[PDB]
Design a protein around this motif. Structure first.
Motif, PDB file in Angstrom:
ATOM      1  N   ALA A 182       0.829  -1.187   0.000  1.00  0.00           N
ATOM      2  CA  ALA A 182       0.000   0.000   0.000  1.00  0.00           C
ATOM      3  C   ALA A 182       0.870   1.246   0.000  1.00  0.00           C
ATOM      4  O   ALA A 182       2.025   1.226   0.445  1.00  0.00           O
ATOM      5  N   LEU A 183       0.261   2.330  -0.489  1.00  0.00           N
ATOM      6  CA  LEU A 183       0.840   3.650  -0.518  1.00  0.00           C
ATOM      7  C   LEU A 183      -0.007   4.558   0.369  1.00  0.00           C
ATOM      8  O   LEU A 183      -1.219   4.627   0.172  1.00  0.00           O
ATOM      9  N   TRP A 184       0.672   5.262   1.275  1.00  0.00           N
ATOM     10  CA  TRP A 184       0.049   6.088   2.306  1.00  0.00           C
ATOM     11  C   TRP A 184       0.478   7.531   2.123  1.00  0.00           C
ATOM     12  O   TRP A 184       1.643   7.851   1.885  1.00  0.00           O
ATOM     13  N   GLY A 185      -0.507   8.425   2.259  1.00  0.00           N
ATOM     14  CA  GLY A 185      -0.209   9.840   2.344  1.00  0.00           C
ATOM     15  C   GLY A 185       0.012  10.224   3.804  1.00  0.00           C
ATOM     16  O   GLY A 185      -0.640   9.684   4.703  1.00  0.00           O
ATOM     17  N   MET A 186       0.947  11.134   4.030  1.00  0.00           N
ATOM     18  CA  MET A 186       1.297  11.497   5.393  1.00  0.00           C
ATOM     19  C   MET A 186       1.111  12.989   5.667  1.00  0.00           C
ATOM     20  O   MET A 186       1.486  13.427   6.749  1.00  0.00           O
ATOM     21  N   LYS A 187       0.518  13.743   4.723  1.00  0.00           N
ATOM     22  CA  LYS A 187       0.281  15.175   4.903  1.00  0.00           C
ATOM     23  C   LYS A 187      -1.144  15.396   5.421  1.00  0.00           C
ATOM     24  O   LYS A 187      -2.096  14.876   4.849  1.00  0.00           O
ATOM     25  N   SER A 188      -1.270  16.168   6.512  1.00  0.00           N
ATOM     26  CA  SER A 188      -2.544  16.518   7.130  1.00  0.00           C
ATOM     27  C   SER A 188      -3.114  15.324   7.894  1.00  0.00           C
ATOM     28  O   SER A 188      -3.230  15.378   9.118  1.00  0.00           O
ATOM     29  N   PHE A 247      -2.986  10.853   7.965  1.00  0.00           N
ATOM     30  CA  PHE A 247      -2.425   9.598   7.491  1.00  0.00           C
ATOM     31  C   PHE A 247      -3.551   8.792   6.856  1.00  0.00           C
ATOM     32  O   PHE A 247      -4.505   8.405   7.524  1.00  0.00           O
ATOM     33  N   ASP A 248      -3.446   8.530   5.554  1.00  0.00           N
ATOM     34  CA  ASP A 248      -4.539   7.869   4.864  1.00  0.00           C
ATOM     35  C   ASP A 248      -3.962   7.034   3.732  1.00  0.00           C
ATOM     36  O   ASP A 248      -2.911   7.381   3.196  1.00  0.00           O
ATOM     37  N   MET A 249      -4.649   5.938   3.413  1.00  0.00           N
ATOM     38  CA  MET A 249      -4.238   5.106   2.294  1.00  0.00           C
ATOM     39  C   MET A 249      -4.636   5.804   0.994  1.00  0.00           C
ATOM     40  O   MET A 249      -5.790   6.203   0.829  1.00  0.00           O
ATOM     41  N   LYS A 250      -3.661   5.983   0.093  1.00  0.00           N
ATOM     42  CA  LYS A 250      -3.888   6.622  -1.195  1.00  0.00           C
ATOM     43  C   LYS A 250      -4.231   5.567  -2.243  1.00  0.00           C
ATOM     44  O   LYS A 250      -5.238   5.673  -2.934  1.00  0.00           O
ATOM     45  N   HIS A 251      -3.369   4.551  -2.379  1.00  0.00           N
ATOM     46  CA  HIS A 251      -3.598   3.470  -3.321  1.00  0.00           C
ATOM     47  C   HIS A 251      -3.071   2.187  -2.707  1.00  0.00           C
ATOM     48  O   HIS A 251      -2.243   2.216  -1.791  1.00  0.00           O
ATOM     49  N   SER A 252      -3.550   1.060  -3.220  1.00  0.00           N
ATOM     50  CA  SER A 252      -3.001  -0.217  -2.817  1.00  0.00           C
ATOM     51  C   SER A 252      -2.623  -1.047  -4.038  1.00  0.00           C
ATOM     52  O   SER A 252      -3.023  -0.743  -5.169  1.00  0.00           O
TER      53      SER A 252
END
Ligand SMILES: NC(=O)C[C@H](NC(=O)c1c[nH]c(/C=C/C(=O)N2CCOCC2)c1-c1ccc(Cl)cc1F)c1ccc(F)c(Cl)c1
Ligand code: NA
Ligand code: NA
Length: 296
Positions: A84-90, A92-97
């Motif tokens: 998985a790819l996670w965003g860490m700005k603002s 923490f959320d999964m962007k794509h898997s």
């Protein structure tokens, strides 16, 4: 020398479950994955946990933060999705898997793509859309390495997958490196000139064999950030991925520097952006890992 600077364990757990590590883009902070699928952020000197995030429902095997601090790749052992790819700005959320890819890396020069590995197969994805751009597999040229791990070269124009060199622009295999071992598929030297496939060092220009380095057999490698030192640790045969030792080599001439036996099985290691510290995950036992920090 590697002088033990500090040590810490997964805070307040009976059994500490660190499995993998990477320094964040943010200094003094180490990111650790755990055997229960969490991402922890530790202050590296205090050894104190600052934050925790839920990523997978199985052990995190590997992680890689983007250089810009905005993104994180994780892979797990027996989850769906496996990476998985996670965003860490603002937030923490999964962007794509990446469903069945058990290993992933960012592209190197510009970090706009992800390359995933599923067995002998490489998948290239766009970070913006998550879309699969390319599947790389040539049945005439495959080496079928059992621990294959696809990767981009420093300028992102080439990929090595299963010991096959691919031109990414044309999506064509340009050269198959001959097979010498059952497991290890190889990496690019950060110099852009050489390919390191197990014990064999190949010239990227000529495809000639330059050197043989026996001590690299069955090793995963990582280079320091300046590209002057290579670290290798031997996989164990197919649980800790590595044995109890790692080795350093001069990346300019492949001469050995040091062999370091920590007398315990190793799960991961990484060096910081400044190459001042080495972090190593070591099993004390029973899964009960610690993270040791060493001054280089
Ligand atoms: N962060 C990095 O890239 C550093 C790299 N780590 C790893 O490679 C790694 C670090 N960990 C793993 C798996 C763990 C695994 O499969 N697990 C552990 C958790 O339980 C389930 C099984 C791997 C790994 C194992 C096999 C394959 Cl083909 C691919 C890999 F990425 C390294 C380089 C040189 C070293 F000297 C050391 Cl000690 C570690
Ligand atoms: Na603080
Ligand atoms: Na050299």
């Amino acid at each position: 020398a590697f002088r033990p600077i500090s040590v810490f364990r997964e805070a307040n757990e009976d059994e500490s479950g660190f499995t993998c590590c990477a320094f964040s883009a943010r200094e003094r902070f180490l990111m650790l994955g755990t055997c229960t699928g969490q991402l922890k952020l530790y202050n590296v000197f205090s050894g104190q946990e600052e934050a925790s995030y839920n990523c997978h429902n199985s052990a995190i095997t590997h992680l890689e933060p983007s250089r810009d601090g905005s993104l994180l790749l994780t892979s797990a052992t027996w989850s769906q999705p496996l990476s998985a790819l996670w965003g860490m700005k603002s937030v923490f959320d999964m962007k794509h898997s990446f469903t069945e890819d058990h290993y992933v890396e960012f592209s190197k020069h510009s970090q706009d793509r992800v390359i995933g590995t599923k067995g002998d197969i490489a998948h290239i994805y766009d970070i913006q859309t998550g879309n699969k751009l390319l599947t790389l597999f040539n049945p005439d040229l495959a080496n079928n390495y059992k621990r294959n791990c696809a990767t981009f070269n420093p300028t992102d124009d080439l990929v090595l997958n299963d010991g096959v060199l691919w031109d990414v622009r044309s999506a064509q295999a340009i050269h198959k490196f001959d097979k010498f071992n059952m497991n290890i598929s190889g990496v690019f030297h950060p110099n852009g000139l050489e390919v390191i496939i197990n014990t064999e060092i190949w010239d990227l220009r000529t495809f000639h064999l330059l050197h043989t380095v026996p001590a690299l057999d069955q090793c995963r490698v990582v280079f320091n950030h300046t590209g002057t030192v290579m670290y290798g640790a031997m996989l164990q045969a197919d649980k800790s991925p590595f044995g109890s030792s790692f080795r350093t080599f001069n990346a300019t001439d492949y001469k050995p520097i040091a062999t370091i036996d920590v007398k315990r099985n190793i799960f991961d290691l990484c060096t910081d952006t400044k190459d001042c510290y080495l972090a190593v995950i070591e099993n004390q036992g029973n899964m009960d890992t610690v993270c040791r920090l060493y001054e280089v």
